[PDB]
Design a protein around this ligand. Structure first.
Ligand SMILES: CC(C)=CCC/C(C)=C/CC/C(C)=C/CC/C(C)=C/Cc1cc(C(=O)O)cc(O)c1O
Length: 351
């Protein structure tokens, strides 16, 4: 089926063109907004989008990633050597983790800044063997809200499965985070993230990290995650959520990445074909995909955001509004598009 492969090419090329044109003056990828507060993310989004595009074999994409890495090196204002949501935010383990994946793609894992950043990641390792997003002193020093002045930050500064999964993509950390990632798997075979509504994100990344480890003992856990991924994907080739009952592009893209970890099962191959089919049909004329990268802001004290039923979408809230207990999305559609195009490139050869 050469027409379906040619459409994947045309779809991927349209998405890459959108992403390259979507960069700002300096050349940053920007997405998400905390209006009249944390403002727009760059360091994080650029680190993620750069890592997503690393799978492309194009020379002009690699040039964009080398510029992305140069822009990150210039962000050297934090004494830890970490990267944050944007300039004004303190360093976090997730951003730093994604920046180190981009570093590896541009052959800069051995660089001074990469070594300093990897060293800083080690401080975020918790007793239970997981990675915490924030150090309490850093995030408290930034936050200047009266309501959250002397509240607990053990939610934001506790070990997170979503961040631990992403950081475990780094070979230096995969072995240390292994045991934490194994015990945090649910009976249904999936994982649950802290900052993300869609479990497919954390499930795909954890399974990929375990797969990269190459340990036979982890294969049953991977196969149980794939089986869960197959249940989540409906016959029409999309992941249905409460928000998007006719399919989330973000969740489906990550589910498609999860299903690449089984390459023998005929039913899994058929599901991937269905997922590619739907994603191709959903792509907008400008090459982007409709924003569905839902980032939630738990209360600083909340360790269990998956047990928080009061989630509201920040932009739909009538009246004066706080970010705590609210969900924000990628308004530029750069985070979503980067996720989808990455999944389509990795999935194309397994048709
Ligand atoms: C971990 C990840 C998925 C990506 C790595 C990048 C991260 C850290 C993504 C998470 C989302 C968060 C919380 C990012 C920091 C920004 C912030 C502390 C937002 C809340 C807030 C701010 C302010 C304020 O700016 O003053 C006032 C608030 O009331 C308020 O809730």
């Amino acid at each position: 089926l050469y027409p379906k492969l040619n459409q994947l090419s045309n779809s991927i090329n349209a998405a890459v063109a959108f992403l390259l044109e979507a960069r700002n003056l300096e050349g940053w990828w920007q997405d998400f907004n905390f209006p009249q507060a944390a403002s727009i993310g760059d360091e994080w989004v650029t680190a993620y989008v750069g890592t997503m595009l690393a799978t492309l074999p194009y020379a002009h994409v690699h040039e964009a990633l080398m510029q992305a890495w140069e822009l990150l090196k210039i962000r050297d204002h934090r004494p830890t050597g970490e990267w944050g949501y944007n300039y004004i935010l303190c360093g976090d383990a997730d951003t730093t983790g994604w920046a180190l994946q981009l570093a590896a793609a541009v052959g800069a894992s051995d660089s001074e800044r990469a070594q300093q950043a990897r060293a800083a990641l080690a401080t975020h390792l918790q007793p239970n063997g997981g990675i915490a997003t924030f150090a309490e002193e850093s995030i408290r020093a930034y936050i200047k809200v009266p309501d959250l002045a002397n509240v607990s930050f053990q939610g934001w500064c506790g070990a997170h499965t979503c961040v631990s999964a992403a950081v475990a993509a780094l070979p230096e950390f995969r072995s240390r985070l292994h045991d934490y990632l194994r015990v945090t798997q649910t009976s249904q075979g999936n994982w649950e993230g802290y900052w993300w509504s869609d479990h497919e994100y954390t499930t795909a990344l954890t399974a990929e990290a375990l797969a990269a480890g190459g340990q036979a003992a982890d294969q049953p856990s991977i196969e149980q995650a794939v089986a869960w991924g197959l249940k989540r994907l409906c016959p029409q080739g999309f992941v249905a959520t409460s928000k998007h009952p006719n399919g989330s592009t973000f969740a489906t893209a990550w589910c498609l990445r999860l299903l690449l970890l089984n390459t023998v099962d005929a039913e899994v191959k058929a599901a991937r074909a269905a997922a590619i089919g739907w994603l191709l049909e959903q792509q907008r004329p400008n090459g982007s995909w409709v924003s569905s990268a839902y980032l939630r802001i738990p209360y600083p004290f909340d360790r269990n955001p998956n047990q928080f039923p009061h989630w509201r979408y920040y932009d739909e809230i009538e009246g004066d509004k706080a970010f705590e207990g609210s969900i924000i999305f990628d308004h530029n559609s750069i985070f979503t598009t980067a996720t989808v195009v990455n999944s389509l490139v990795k999935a194309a050869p397994m048709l």
